[PDB]
Amino acid sequence: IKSALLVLEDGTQFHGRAIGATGSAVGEVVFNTSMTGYQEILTDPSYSRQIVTLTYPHIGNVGTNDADEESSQVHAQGLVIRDLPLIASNFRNTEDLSSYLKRHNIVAIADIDTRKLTRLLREKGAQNGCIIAGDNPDAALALEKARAFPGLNGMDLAKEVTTAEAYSWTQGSWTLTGGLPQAKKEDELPFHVVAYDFGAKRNILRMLVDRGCRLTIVPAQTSAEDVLKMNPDGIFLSNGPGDPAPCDYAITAIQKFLETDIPVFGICLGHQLLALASGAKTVKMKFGHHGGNHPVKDVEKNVVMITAQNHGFAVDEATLPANLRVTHKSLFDGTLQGIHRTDKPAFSFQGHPEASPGPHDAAPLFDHFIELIEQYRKT
Amino acid sequence: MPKRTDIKSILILGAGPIVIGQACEFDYSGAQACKALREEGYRVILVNSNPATIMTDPEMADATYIEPIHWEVVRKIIEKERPDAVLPTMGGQTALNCALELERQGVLEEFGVTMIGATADAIDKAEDRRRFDVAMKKIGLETARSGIAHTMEEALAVAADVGFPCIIRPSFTMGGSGGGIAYNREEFEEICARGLDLSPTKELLIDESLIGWKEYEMEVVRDKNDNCIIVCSIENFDAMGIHTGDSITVAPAQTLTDKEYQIMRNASMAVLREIGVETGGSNVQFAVNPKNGRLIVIEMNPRVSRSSALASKATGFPIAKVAAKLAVGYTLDELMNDITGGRTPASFEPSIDYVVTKIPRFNFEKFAGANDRLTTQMKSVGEVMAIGRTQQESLQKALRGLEVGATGFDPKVSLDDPEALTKIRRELKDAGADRIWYIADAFRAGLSVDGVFNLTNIDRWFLVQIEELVRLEEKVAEVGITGLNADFLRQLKRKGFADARLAKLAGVREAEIRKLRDQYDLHPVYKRVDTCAAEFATDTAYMYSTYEEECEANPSTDREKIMVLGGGPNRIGQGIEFDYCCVHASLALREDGYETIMVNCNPETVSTDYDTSDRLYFEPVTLEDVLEIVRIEKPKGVIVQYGGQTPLKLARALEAAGVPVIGTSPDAIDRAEDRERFQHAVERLKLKQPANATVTAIEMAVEKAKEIGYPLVVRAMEIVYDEADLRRYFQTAVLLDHFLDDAVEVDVDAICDGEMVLIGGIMEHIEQAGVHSGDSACSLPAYTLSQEIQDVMRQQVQKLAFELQVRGLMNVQFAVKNNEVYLIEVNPRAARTVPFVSKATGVPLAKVAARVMAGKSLAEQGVTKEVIPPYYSVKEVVLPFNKFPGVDPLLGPEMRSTGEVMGVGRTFAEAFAKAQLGSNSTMKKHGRALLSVREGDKERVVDLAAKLLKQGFELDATHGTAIVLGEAGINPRLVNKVHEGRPHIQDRIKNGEYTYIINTTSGRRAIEDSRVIRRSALQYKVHYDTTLNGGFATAMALNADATEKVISVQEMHAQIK
Ligand SMILES: Nc1ncnc2c1ncn2[C@@H]1O[C@H](COP(=O)(O)OP(=O)(O)O)[C@@H](O)[C@H]1O
Ligand SMILES: Nc1ncnc2c1ncn2[C@@H]1O[C@H](COP(=O)(O)OP(=O)(O)O)[C@@H](O)[C@H]1O
Ligand SMILES: NC(=O)CC[C@H](N)C(=O)O
Ligand SMILES: NC(=O)CC[C@H](N)C(=O)O
Ligand SMILES: CC[N+](CC)(CC)CC
Ligand SMILES: NCCC[C@H](N)C(=O)O
Ligand SMILES: [Cl-]
Ligand SMILES: [Cl-]
Ligand SMILES: [Cl-]
Ligand SMILES: [Cl-]
Ligand SMILES: [Cl-]
Ligand SMILES: [Cl-]
Ligand SMILES: [Cl-]
Ligand SMILES: [K+]
Ligand SMILES: [K+]
Ligand SMILES: [K+]
Ligand SMILES: [K+]
Ligand SMILES: [K+]
Ligand SMILES: [K+]
Ligand SMILES: [K+]
Ligand SMILES: [Mn+2]
Ligand SMILES: [Mn+2]
Ligand SMILES: [Mn+2]
Ligand SMILES: [Mn+2]
Secondary structure, three states, rough: EEEEEEEOOOOOEEEEEOOOOEEEEEEEEEEEOOOOHHHHHHOOOOHHEEEEEOOOOOOOOOOOOOOOOOOOOOEEEEEOEEOOOOOOOOOOOOHHHHHHHHHHOOOEEEEHHHHHHHHHHHHOOEEEEEEEEEEOOOHHHHHHHHHOOOOOOEEOOOHHHHHOOOOOOOOOOOOOOOOOOOOOOOOOOOEEEEEEOOOOOOHHHHHHOOOOOOEEEEOOOHHHHHHHHHOOEEEEEHHHHHOOOHHHHHHHHHHHOOOOOOOEEEEEEHHHHHHHHHOOOOOEEEEEEEEEEEEEEEEEEEEEEEEEEEEEEEHHHHHHHOOEEEEEEEEOOOOOEEEEEEOOEEEOOOOOOOOOOOOOHHOHHHHHHHHHHHHHOOO | OOOOOOOOEEEOOOOOOEEEEEEOOOHHHHHHHHHHHHHHHOEEEOOOOOOHHHHOOOOOOOEEEEEOOHHHHHHHHEEEEEEEEOOOOOEEEEEHHHHHHHHHHOOHHOOOOOOOOOOOHHHHHHHHHHHHHHHHHOOOOOOOOOEEEEOHHHHHHHHHHHHOOOOEEEEEOOOOOOOEEOHHHHHHHHHHHHHHOOOOOOOOEEEEOOOOOOEEEEEEOOOOOOEEEEEEEEOOOOOOOHHHHHHEEOOOOOOOOOHHHHHHHHHHHHHHHOOOOOOOEEEEEEEEOOOOOEEEEEEOOOOOOHHHHHHHHHHHOHHHHHHHHHHOOOOHHEEEEEOOOOEEEOOOOOOOOOOOEEEEEEOOHHHOOOOOEEEOOOOOOOOEEEEEEOHHHHHHHHHHHOOOOOOOOOOOOOOOOOOOHHHHHHHHHOOOOOOOHHHHHHHHHOOOOHHHHHHOOHHHHHHHHHHHHHHHHHHHHHHHHHHHHHHHHHHHHHHOHHHHHHHHOOOOOOOHHHHHHOOOOOOOEEOOOOOOOOOOOOOOEEEEEEEEOOOOOOOOOOOOOEEEOOOOOOOOOOOOOHHHHHHHHHHHHHOOOEEEEEOOOOOOOOOOOOOHHEEOOOOOOHHHHHHHHHHHOOOOOOOOOOOHHHOOOOOHHHHHHOOOOOOOOOOHHHHHOOOOHHHHHHHOOOOOOOEEEEEEOOOHHHHOOOOOOOOOEEOOOEEEEOOHHHHHHHHHEEEEEOOOOOEEEEEEEEOOOOOOEEEEEEEEOOOOOOOHHHHHOEOOOOOOOOEEEEHHHHHHHHHHHHHOOEEEEEEEEEEEEEOOEEEEEEEEEOOOOHHHHHHOOOOHHHHHHHHHHOOOOOOOOOOOOOOOOOOOEEEEEEEEHHOOOOOOOOOOOOOOOOOEEEEEEHHHHHHHHHHHHOOOOOOOOOOOOEEEHHHHHHHHHHHHHHHHOOOOEEEEEEEEHHHHOHHHHHHEEEEEOOOOOOHHHHHHHHHOOEEEEEOOOOHHHHHHHHHHHHHHHHHOOOOOEEOOOHHHHHHHHHOOOOOOOOHHHHHHHHHOO
């Protein structure tokens, strides 16, 4: 018997089986509707301090492999699923899910009513919780930890995941045929982009390289100054965990960049930041956007995209300065999804154009960024 | 973007009669397309020869045509109705093909009819195999190595390049029709010949084998604004090589990584774009090499399908509904998602928090000499679907809802059989309809997963789960009921284990296992389908059972509920006809204010559509499943009479367990159903019945037989001619009955409320008694029976209604011999002819009877008089012989038909002509007829030859038949039997000398020797009649013109006094 238990702040208990590391895990609980891509999800830094619940019952069907790691590690605090398959069945698999979780010392539970969990989260909203895996997990104690959890609202997690030192990235996208390409030389990549690491996913980088971009990944707290000193063709603001708001250092820099004519594009957190930096306000979502089937409309072109989401906070459009134009909107709830500055070469998108996992539908987003860059390199 | 102003009216092409590979899925879809366009203010016109459809119900469209699906016939509908547009994607292959004929024939131009949904060019790009493959080249997708062939010589060249085994697939066909896998030149030749001639464009695509690769399907939807969504992904359990329609399949895909999935998804979209589908749905098929993920595109179907219907059921997203709207200009963003109460658009990709499993239903036992191995040509007759929270649960539930008597992984082979492993091995290596079961048995016998993988090519992801269930079963047998502690029981229940399966393993009654669960507070909870994995609330009650924590049933307290039990998967003799009835009970009662609850698991029908009832429990129709629903709903009544055999067989047990079965009681039913009980009733009432007995031993037979007199009906029904003939049976081989030779069979459908009896319809079959009613063409009104004789029947039915205490529907079968009425059988429930009668008579018998069952008298309804329409209505069937070539295409006491058609005319001959053409008959009004009848028909055949000569037919005849003709002044050209010389009948058939054949036979021997005539006629598409009555009917039809006039159902109905 390998017991595990999950308790939410409200006392709701979920008894099941331990599939990961023995221990306890605490964080804000979320549900992701994605049918595939659990690994990518696990390793996405945006999940820092979050207990990820997956709605699709069978998780680990294809085991795991390195190409499917969206970062150096698993950032989810915990993992909650209904069923851990008896085996992984896929030619790309290098390690079954249990072993991999244990390997990354992640506390995980299976065998629980994940749909009950999902509906609770949807109706009452996000809730903090704790998982205890081990001999006789103490529910009172799980309740305690779940209650002690400080909450993600007002929490700057970007500074927590960011890179100590700045590095270069010159590797592109994986291919069935070739797999993950070798890192390119610098004289190959035409442009130079500076990407602020706020818990950046490998994919966005790769996708940037793909479009001729040589990258310089700088710590989250990098100053505009030392940035403007690199003669950046463009400036990128990565996705990342927690509240964007408490990120003063980012807002300041960004505001500085925006005094410039250098092009700026941000995704997810980056997007939020850019909005905050422009005088826009951010809000915490009841339950957030976590799935890979999110319809997003490009209001300009009147077209729809299926997109990958992963955000607990959003930009209040009713607080949008008049310099920020609404480019995209969620077809599910009406929430703001993309913005462009009427005065500067700055645009951002809430969803994940890089996907991984998910529909490739918002990839063309990168393109406008590149356009701007080429144009910047014009003048 | 919004609806189209240039289009006021729309013609929707129906699918026609139910056939293997093209079934009930088209009524579900067609019904949805009608519903959707009618909600939008569009004029709806549609054509469907199949009367047993909800889509042909009068109130569902403006102008409904139950006429043969022939271009010339449609043309008459166009002419008359003048449709602005035509939607050809809702009716299977039949609609695609008709649409293109009408194009080709210039009818679309003639009448300025616009083709919506899919264009003729898109359709062809997809259906023409050459074109599709070229299309792939264009978009950079890969296809297996293949070659086109328009001739047999072309075909062998291709076989030589790709090698054996090779796969053959004709252009313009689906469901694997005309195709197959060839392992040798012999099979190559037989299949290529069949495909060549069955293909509407006479072309075959021949491919290298990808047998064993994984098989996937995706359902795609696209709008005019180019928005594109994947509605559902499907992973086949059975690998490449077994048609998807004959395979077990699951949703969503399970073994693809996200990276692979996106490649697949993207490919899917590129396919649609390239083929040219911009306003509607399409299914894309692929093959994936498990070893390296190599993706190969297989085909694409530019219309709704059996997968789109399964996809809709699986996800809760109504594809057909949405596609209809999309054909009239709507876009996905503008349409609202039904099951999330419209708070979300249709522009999204569903997400499911459960596992959906489909298992095909077969009927091999009906076609004994047929090859029973699964291949690329579909052979299944229906399908079951189940929803579970895990694959295991999903799979066992589906097995128990299959209506094959399984309770899950029931063993097929005993552990102590020394050759057991050999049989198992054969069954795994070359799959039959029972493979699933053999898989568990291999594990019971010690075969490893790898061992099984190697033989079946079934992904180990699935195999391991089956192996696990086996080990669990092993444990239950070991510990018994004693070891079934609350914790273990819960575990087993959560794996799908049926109480019956557990009782069997543990050696106790199922009821004891059921009681045990109550003890431990172990009842399932119900979860809801919502298309979004609980992301959004739903106001819909579409549920499935599961062993989890929270329940979403939330049964109302407020109202009066009526539950309707469906029949599960379709099978021969258990068709869409019962489902129509079920639907009708629910629509009527709901309209009446009752809250209705449908219990069914067939994904192809309207009964399982969420709009059909207040509450839908998509579950196995079993005692266990139903009991759990009643437990929580506490309905006022439960209808057991409309779903066919399935529910019928549960009535006694339901009642026993305390269910409020309304309508005709389970004992009353059994009274009828019971041979003993019955034979008594018949006497009591002083009614005529064939002479019968119940023999145990042979020699008791001969005697009893000598006494009842031959011919005899031996209840696998055979007709034994003589004593010598009986042993013959006896050996090869109990109810014994005197066969009523040269008798007119009749079907009477009626309603009894305890107060009165309403005669629904009196139907005279064309084929005589001895040819199953289910396979007989029939007439309404009767075309030869005397008012007098019929009045007798009428009275005889009324007598039986009261006697058995019928409450609702009933059907009585008679035989009229020598102006004398005899009783064949009483079916105190809804019969398969109901929808036919309803359509012919405009009276909705299933609705009336439902009300009656619920408590509204006939009186009360204003339904008291029997309706004799002014016109003639004829029903004809479609037989699946072409799908099992090795079978003798001959009629008999056992039912084998899959579907039916309706013909309406001013004369019986007109109606019969319409039935005939609607049934896909190849009969012509010229040429040469072949007459080869038996003794008893020789005399009567004279008049038939006269008729034909009179219609301009030349005549050929076999020796004996020519003799008698000659003796009556008719000199046919003689033909040799095969043993007689050359050329013989077969050479002539093969050589196209005949346009029509009449071949009647008697005797096991005789039949066996004449087999070549019938197999030949079938193979060569020559219209043939195996009964003189059929002959006479066909002869009359010759004086009719099935294309002359058309009439709508509404028009039919108004014409009624
Ligand atoms: N190259 C192949 N090797 C093995 N099986 C194949 C191959 N191509 C197709 N099949 C099988 O043939 C079945 C029928 O082919 P398909 O193109 O779907 O025709 P249809 O339109 O009649 O349904 C598929 O469901 C699949 O299992
Ligand atoms: N005594 C009989 N004489 C002649 N034909 C019979 C007789 N009994 C049955 N048949 C034929 O067999 C068919 C099936 O008989 P029935 O008793 O109704 O079986 P089922 O249960 O399949 O309906 C009838 O529709 C009829 O054509
Ligand atoms: N199960 C129900 O009764 C549905 C309740 C509610 N609308 C929901 O979506 O949760
Ligand atoms: N009535 C029949 O069908 C005659 C038998 C058949 N022609 C034979 O070759 O034996
Ligand atoms: C599959 C249905 N048919 C081809 C479209 C053959 C029965 C109708 C003629
Ligand atoms: N109603 C049965 C189909 C008729 C077929 N032509 C036969 O006479 O055998
Ligand atoms: Cl739980
Ligand atoms: Cl036609
Ligand atoms: Cl076809
Ligand atoms: Cl390969
Ligand atoms: Cl066969
Ligand atoms: Cl135990
Ligand atoms: Cl019936
Ligand atoms: K549990
Ligand atoms: K038109
Ligand atoms: K096709
Ligand atoms: K090819
Ligand atoms: K298959
Ligand atoms: K298919
Ligand atoms: K008959
Ligand atoms: Mn097809
Ligand atoms: Mn197919
Ligand atoms: Mn019968
Ligand atoms: Mn019967």
